[PDB]
Amino acid sequence: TLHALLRDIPAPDAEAMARTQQHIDGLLKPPGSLGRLETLAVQLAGMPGLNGTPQVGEKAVLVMCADHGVWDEGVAVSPKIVTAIQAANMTRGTTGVCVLAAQAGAKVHVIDVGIDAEPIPGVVNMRVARGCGNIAVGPAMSRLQAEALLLEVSRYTCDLAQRGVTLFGVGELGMANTTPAAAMVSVFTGSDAKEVVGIGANLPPSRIDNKVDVVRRAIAINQPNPRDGIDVLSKVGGFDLVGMTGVMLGAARCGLPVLLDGFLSYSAALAACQIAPAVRPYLIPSHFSAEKGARIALAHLSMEPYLHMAMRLGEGSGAALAMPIVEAACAMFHNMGELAASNIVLPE
Amino acid sequence: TLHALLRDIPAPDAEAMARTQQHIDGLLKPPGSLGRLETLAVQLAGMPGLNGTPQVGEKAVLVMCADHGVWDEGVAVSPKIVTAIQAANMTRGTTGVCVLAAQAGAKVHVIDVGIDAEPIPGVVNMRVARGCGNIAVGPAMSRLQAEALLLEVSRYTCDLAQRGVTLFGVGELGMANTTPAAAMVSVFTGSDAKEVVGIGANLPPSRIDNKVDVVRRAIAINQPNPRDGIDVLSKVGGFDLVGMTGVMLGAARCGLPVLLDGFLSYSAALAACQIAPAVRPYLIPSHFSAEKGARIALAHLSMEPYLHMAMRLGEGSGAALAMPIVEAACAMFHNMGELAASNIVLPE
Ligand SMILES: Nc1ncnc2[nH]cnc12
Numbered sequence: 001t002l003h004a005l006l007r008d009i010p011a012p013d014a015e016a017m018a019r020t021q022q023h024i025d026g027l028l029k030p031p032g033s034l035g036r037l038e039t040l041a042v043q044l045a046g047m048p049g050l051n052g053t054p055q056v057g058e059k060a061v062l063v064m065c066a067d068h069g070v071w072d073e074g075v076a077v078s079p080k081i082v083t084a085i086q087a088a089n090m091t092r093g094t095t096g097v098c099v100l101a102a103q104a105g106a107k108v109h110v111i112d113v114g115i116d117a118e119p120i121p122g123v124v125n126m127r128v129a130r131g132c133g134n135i136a137v138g139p140a141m142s143r144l145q146a147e148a149l150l151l152e153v154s155r156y157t158c159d160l161a162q163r164g165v166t167l168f169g170v171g172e173l174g175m176a177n178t179t180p181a182a183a184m185v186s187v188f189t190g191s192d193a194k195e196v197v198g199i200g201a202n203l204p205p206s207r208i209d210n211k212v213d214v215v216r217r218a219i220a221i222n223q224p225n226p227r228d229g230i231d232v233l234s235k236v237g238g239f240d241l242v243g244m245t246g247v248m249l250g251a252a253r254c255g256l257p258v259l260l261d262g263f264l265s266y267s268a269a270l271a272a273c274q275i276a277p278a279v280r281p282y283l284i285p286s287h288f289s290a291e292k293g294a295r296i297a298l299a300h301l302s303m304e305p306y307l308h309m310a311m312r313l314g315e316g317s318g319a320a321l322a323m324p325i326v327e328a329a330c331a332m333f334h335n336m337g338e339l340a341a342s343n344i345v346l347p348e
Numbered sequence: 349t350l351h352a353l354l355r356d357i358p359a360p361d362a363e364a365m366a367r368t369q370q371h372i373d374g375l376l377k378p379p380g381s382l383g384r385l386e387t388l389a390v391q392l393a394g395m396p397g398l399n400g401t402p403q404v405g406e407k408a409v410l411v412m413c414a415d416h417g418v419w420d421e422g423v424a425v426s427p428k429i430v431t432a433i434q435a436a437n438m439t440r441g442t443t444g445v446c447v448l449a450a451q452a453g454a455k456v457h458v459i460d461v462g463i464d465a466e467p468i469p470g471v472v473n474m475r476v477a478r479g480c481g482n483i484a485v486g487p488a489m490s491r492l493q494a495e496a497l498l499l500e501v502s503r504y505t506c507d508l509a510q511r512g513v514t515l516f517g518v519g520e521l522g523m524a525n526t527t528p529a530a531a532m533v534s535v536f537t538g539s540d541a542k543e544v545v546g547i548g549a550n551l552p553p554s555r556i557d558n559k560v561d562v563v564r565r566a567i568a569i570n571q572p573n574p575r576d577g578i579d580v581l582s583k584v585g586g587f588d589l590v591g592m593t594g595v596m597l598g599a600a601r602c603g604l605p606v607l608l609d610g611f612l613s614y615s616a617a618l619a620a621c622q623i624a625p626a627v628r629p630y631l632i633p634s635h636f637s638a639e640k641g642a643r644i645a646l647a648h649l650s651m652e653p654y655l656h657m658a659m660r661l662g663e664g665s666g667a668a669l670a671m672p673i674v675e676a677a678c679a680m681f682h683n684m685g686e687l688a689a690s691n692i693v694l695p696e
């Protein structure tokens with residue numbers, strides 16, 4: 001059951017963190033000189049699934065794929081089938097996330113949570129329906145549906161942990177996905193749609209107006225309650241969004257770190273944190289998405305990404321690209337020499 | 349001779365770049381979706397030493413070590429000997445740059461251009477003198493000295509290329525080094541010293557005032573000519589700074605890319621670009637240094653770093669940390685599938 005899951009998310013280990021901090025301070029460098037790498041190391045040491053130290057075992061990127069009924073509103077220029085095509089490509093290792101994950105030594109897990117096509121061999125089957133409801137005229141799905149998918153994904157996630165995975169990355173694939181993402185951000189942050197609606201996958205500037213209108217409509221019609229993340233996800237989200245949120249809850253329950261991706265991922269994170277604030281300490285930002293509503297979303301999460309690449313591909317590509325940074329914090333922690341051993345003495 | 353060297357720096361290959369751009373546009377993703385990774389790939393393809401394509405062979409980080417007479421002005425809290433100690437540690441693989449380079453699969457080259465100590469076995473000997481002159485009361489060195497070191501380092505650099513190195517990173521090690529760095533930045537950018545003088549290696553806030561004064565003094569006394577980078581380096585720079593500039597000139601002559609590090613490196617880059625504007629296209633920013641004058645320096649170089657880590661260690665640690673990003677752009681270019689092969693058609 002979900003209340004359980006949520007109840008059992010562990011708090012960070014302050015004891016391990018204090019020990020890490022001390023250790024870091026004693027390394028062969030001026031104190032605090034490695035800035036964010038230091039902070040990251042300490043954050044990791046506090047994660048219970050990591051065994052009191054910054055460490056990275058196996059790495060996995062979970063890609064949540066699904067179609068959206070809102071596509072029918074003219075909010076996306078990519079043909080609908082691209083979701084299904086790209087999902088298959090994920091199985092062949094030719095996509096952007098695939099290439100970047102291989103470079104990071106991570107394995108990619110492609111999960112179908114609701115593609116509007118026949119099942120794709122090689123893809124993890126967790127399909128809710130053939131694409132979610134069109135949010136412009138009603139809810140994306142039922143609360144039950146959302147809750148069940150949350151449970152299902154969270155479990156799959158924590159189970160990988162059982163197989164040696166210590167670091168997750170989350171991603172999505174779904175045509176028209178920046179629409180539900182903007183709606184969610186608008187609702188959670190109380191920003192006006194104009195402020196958070198972007199061009200997604202090369203939407204022409206002309207067509208923007210309509211996208212903003214669709215977003216407002218979705219919100220007005222559904223009346224999602226901002227204090228209820230599940231309410232929001234079910235009404236104006238999508239299966240893919242629900243799935244990403246589920247990865248987050250799962251990794252937190254498991255006491256392990258999750259690397260966010262871009263805009264879509266920020267939307268899901270907002271939901272996750274609303275649902276369970278205890279999730280927060282397990283999230284690690286990757287890059288700063290080029291999507292318009294990115295700054296607002298990040299501000300609400302109080303997150304400052306490490307990478308500024310103007311990326312807007314999705315798929316979990318940003319997450320993969322940041323994995324080496326996480327590994328660097330561990331390397332720093334473990335392999336650097338100590339000041340004391342050099343007889344070096346530097347003022348705090 | 350230097351005029352030669354400078355004269356022979358190759359322009360970027362526009363033909364290769366056009367071909368790269370086209371190729372990138374045809375990959376399995378919405379056009380321009382990979383943002384800066386795309387731009388980086390194109391930049392690399394234009395570098396003659398790379399053989400018309402984004403590629404990365406062997407990687408090296410060159411660490412320039414030297415002492416500064418200005419240390420006697422009370423501008424640095426690290427004891428002087430730390431330079432010599434850390435330089436030796438570089439030979440043992442225990443320093444920050446060492447750990448990060450190993451993580452990136454790069455080799456570290458420690459070069460002594462003027463440490464105020466006995467020679468360190470294992471360190472490349474290119475020592476000019478036992479520490480440079482105190483810039484607060486006169487020049488750091490003679491023009492001749494600077495010119496010769498420029499030549500010497502540039503040659504060493506291009507020679508590594510001959511051994512399979514395709515990507516360099518530059519770094520420095522030297523107590524009190526942020527002082528000459530600030531002076532240089534002030535002179536090249538025409539900013540007031542207060543604006544560019546930082547805390548370096550944990551300088552106490554109280555002591556700042558004196559550092560600003562030392563910088564102004566150096567400038568007033570020496571009257572370095574901003575339109576003459578060699579003039580500037582020789583007067584208010586240091587051996588380490590000269591060395592970094594030399595790496596830059598060398599890699600450019602060789603038609604290969606160089607990853608900058610932090611503040612010190614930006615100072616050297618400003619000099620290099622002043623000396624030879626043709627160097628510019630070969631430079632790649634890594635991170636955004638936490639040193640105060642960082643923003644000003646970057647603005648003058650028109651560079652936007654990829655990494656925001658609040659780092660201020662030096663040694664070339666930021667350069668190392670960015671190597672995987674460069675490799676990612678190559679992986680993207682080479683391993684991704686093509687839209688056409690999927691029968692996918694997306695609007696530009
Ligand atoms: N002041 C310093 N102390 C120790 N290691 C360093 N590496 C770079 N600067 C340093």
Ligand SMILES: Nc1ncnc2[nH]cnc12
Pocket residue numbers: 078082086173174175201313314315376377378
């Ligand atoms: N619209 C899109 N087209 C192709 N690949 C994609 N990966 C993520 N979004 C995509």
